[PDB]
Amino acid sequence: ANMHQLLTELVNRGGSDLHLTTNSPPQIRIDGKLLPLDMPPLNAVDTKQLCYSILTEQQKHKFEENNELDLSFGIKGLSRFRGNVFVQRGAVAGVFRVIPYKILSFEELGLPPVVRELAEKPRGLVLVTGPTGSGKSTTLAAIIDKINTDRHEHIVTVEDPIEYLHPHKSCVVNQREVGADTKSFKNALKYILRQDPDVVLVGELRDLETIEAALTLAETGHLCFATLHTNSAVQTINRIVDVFPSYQQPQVRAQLSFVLEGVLSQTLLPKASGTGRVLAIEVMVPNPAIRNLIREDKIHQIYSQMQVGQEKFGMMTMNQCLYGLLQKRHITMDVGMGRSPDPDELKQMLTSG
Amino acid sequence: MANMHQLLTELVNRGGSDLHLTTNSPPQIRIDGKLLPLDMPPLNAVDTKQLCYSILTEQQKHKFEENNELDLSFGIKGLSRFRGNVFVQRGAVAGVFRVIPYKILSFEELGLPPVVRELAEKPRGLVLVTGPTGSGKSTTLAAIIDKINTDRHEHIVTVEDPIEYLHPHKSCVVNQREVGADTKSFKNALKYILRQDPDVVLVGELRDLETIEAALTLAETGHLCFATLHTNSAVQTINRIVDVFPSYQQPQVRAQLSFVLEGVLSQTLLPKASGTGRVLAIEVMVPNPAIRNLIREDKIHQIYSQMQVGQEKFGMMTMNQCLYGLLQKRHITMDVGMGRSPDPDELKQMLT
Amino acid sequence: ANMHQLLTELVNRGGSDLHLTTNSPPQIRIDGKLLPLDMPPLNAVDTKQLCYSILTEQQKHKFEENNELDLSFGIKGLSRFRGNVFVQRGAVAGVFRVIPYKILSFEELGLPPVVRELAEKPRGLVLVTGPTGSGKSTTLAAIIDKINTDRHEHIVTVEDPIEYLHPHKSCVVNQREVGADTKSFKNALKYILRQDPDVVLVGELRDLETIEAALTLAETGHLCFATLHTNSAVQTINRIVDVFPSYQQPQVRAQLSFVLEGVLSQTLLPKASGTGRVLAIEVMVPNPAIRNLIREDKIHQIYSQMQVGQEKFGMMTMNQCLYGLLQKRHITMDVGMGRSPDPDELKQMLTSGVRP
């Protein structure tokens, strides 16, 4: 009934987010969907006492000045949390995310064995892309945890915001949160070469400066991880090249062909059973043929190379993953078709074999 | 301050559309389109300020005094909600107040085609409801937001200036932020929206360059974004969005739009042929793979031809095709249907 | 007060403007031309004394901070006035414009009956154009007053500045003065749709933003009035189109062809008697043929349709109006010819075997 009990239940019930707003009971997001708790609806007095109970006095003043506040806090013996407090219809409202210290393993996440091998790469650019909540941070956290476990190197992450904490194991891990630890991605990236890193996570490739920063890191002997909100390997490569002026795109294509070591495009789909989510992932691992196609500006022909790189490189097109999920009845036909980038291709391959 | 409450009660009881308060005239109510003065003495400058200020918050009174303009909404328990505009004329306060029903109308009550219901089922993307002021945009948006609220277990956040339709929680969590009270501005609300775990976001009118980039970012990162524009057609809407950006960034914006656009609705309310009420005429564009290439290929005007043949497959409909059907079914007069066609000669060919 | 007496003489003598400046007697503008009053020339002491006699303490302080001041004021039993005070050659100077409360009728203004029929339009765009002091606000005030009399609708005006005041009749009339009631045309037009209007006066079509606002008003079921400074219907339509980029001119021409309901272009000419001025006006009322010519980018061919549209559509070219002013001997031959856009056509009209 208080903030401590709600946050403990959020962790205990495997929720990702707790929502507190007027005229609704506390609600928790489990596997992406909100489920209300068996409690009376809150009023404006309730949402204010609950949200204020986890703020410092200085934080309460800054929220009252702007009607907005981002913060993080810890509950001893429980978990860390990300909070956002705001105002709607004249009342306090809040959303609170658990940030787990412990990452589940690759097999628990449904990630193919090639993801474990990407975590062993000495150098290059590895891109994990997809929409919000498609599993990107969990894959990145699993990869970084394997690196942390296996290497004696320096890992620096720049995140907006940090979604997983990595205690030091064999690596030295420094994590900078945008907006608190560092002013911006640009400022962190301006000094990242002066911090003796070996592995760097740069977050979303939001602008040209960040793309150039990720390419330089990957060219100078570092393992660079970044995200995009693209849905396929080809769409990912096109977005990176096409954001640059036409005159500088030849160099970017040449740069990408040398340093790119893997592209993972994930999506979480509803299970046909109606409970839980299943991972759909497109995997592109560059071979000499794909690297030439990038340099030759034959980006779209990379898809044909992914269709035949399953046994050799662990590649898998998005349609090839949906096909396997369909034969095992993990997703319905309606969900698979609404997600296929080419439903006619997936339809024809289902009829044969 | 209790006189204003009684005037609005009289406005509701007499079936009026709008209440007018201005100096040197009695309160006037629009009934069936025509103004009628109430049998009361005329107001002075003190009165129009006193009545209008009685329904303002202290901030709203300081916001109004800073700009000599103010839009707002408020509710009267047991009566109705109302949208108000207060302004200044000849050195005195004036006000107009419209009626906002508590009960949100259905798709069929609003005259919205079944394709709007399928747009309400989209999991992510950008859906634009456009038109000039009072073209039914908030009513259409509320119907869309009410269907998602009814059907989904997701988090809906709206940013409104002001909040018009209220959406009680159903199966969704719905948070509605009013600019100038709950949040300082659209810019400030959008700065924090990514930390609030939203699934569906209403950002209001695409009023400037900065909000459009924010709306494209929300829709690109896996969210369903609703926004409005002032344009009157799908093609005019797409051109307006791209052309506000500097020439060097327009290639990316067209590329983003080809990926993220999920629907364009351009509405307009016309008087009914019976002489009572207004009926919705709507142009609906839902991008298919063909339209997405036309967007990427910068052949935006050829999109109109695609809408003419996408009715059965995709539920598409040009404005002229909608006006033709409303005219044949006797919902509108010939002058109103002709007075709205963007190409009156095309509608003639369909008439034959 | 001498100032009280000067303003009474200005009103009584039908002057439009009173001028007070150093080394000249007070001068009043009568029929567009300045005429000095039979008084000794004023000095700097006089001009500061006369202008300060009508200022509040707050106005005197603001004028002294900038050497500029706009204001309006009323004189009980006389008239209201719009004033401007400034400084020149180290001395105070002032100009004062009268704002009449009473609007003259259409026939008094010399406006043809077709203008009255334009006031009965339920929707569309009606443009009243001409140079400064060509009677535009006066024509607009007569139209607004007829609408106010005949309709139960909401009239909103946005003006820079307000020229005629309209007491309520059957309409509710709200008049917003730029720089006092509202910050700008842009802000008034930003909220005008939320103000439940039926008839809107938007002032000068100064930029694309205002033209786009008027087109939106005219398309959504409103009657919109606006002004330009063009001298003919064809010149008026082209001026509106040519303000847009070349790629967007097709749409603007298409919009105008749909919503345009009337174009009036005026000029005030001296009378043959030497007293008063007579209105010369060109009237274009769009028919289906003219609307097509607009859409087809055949604007110059619109004039030929106007030459034959008096009886059918109530149209009237400038030359046809000048012809009528010449037959009634209201203007001299030189004045009529000096304004004709085509003197040879007007000559042909005068040398007619069907002349009567």
Author numbering:
A (entry chain A): 2 to 354
B (entry chain F): 1 to 352
C (entry chain E): 2 to 357
From the paper:
The three OCOCOC PilT structures described here are the only examples of PilT in this conformation determined to date. The RMSDCα of these two structures with the methylated OCOCOC PilT structure is 1.9 Å per hexamer. The model built into the C3 symmetric map is consistent with the OCOCOC PilT structure (RMSDCα 1.3 Å/hexamer). Before symmetry was applied to this map, it more closely matched the methylated C3 symmetric structure of PilT than the pseudo-C3 symmetric structures, suggesting that the slight asymmetry of the latter is a crystallographic artifact.
PilB is the ATPase that powers pilin polymerization in the T4aP.
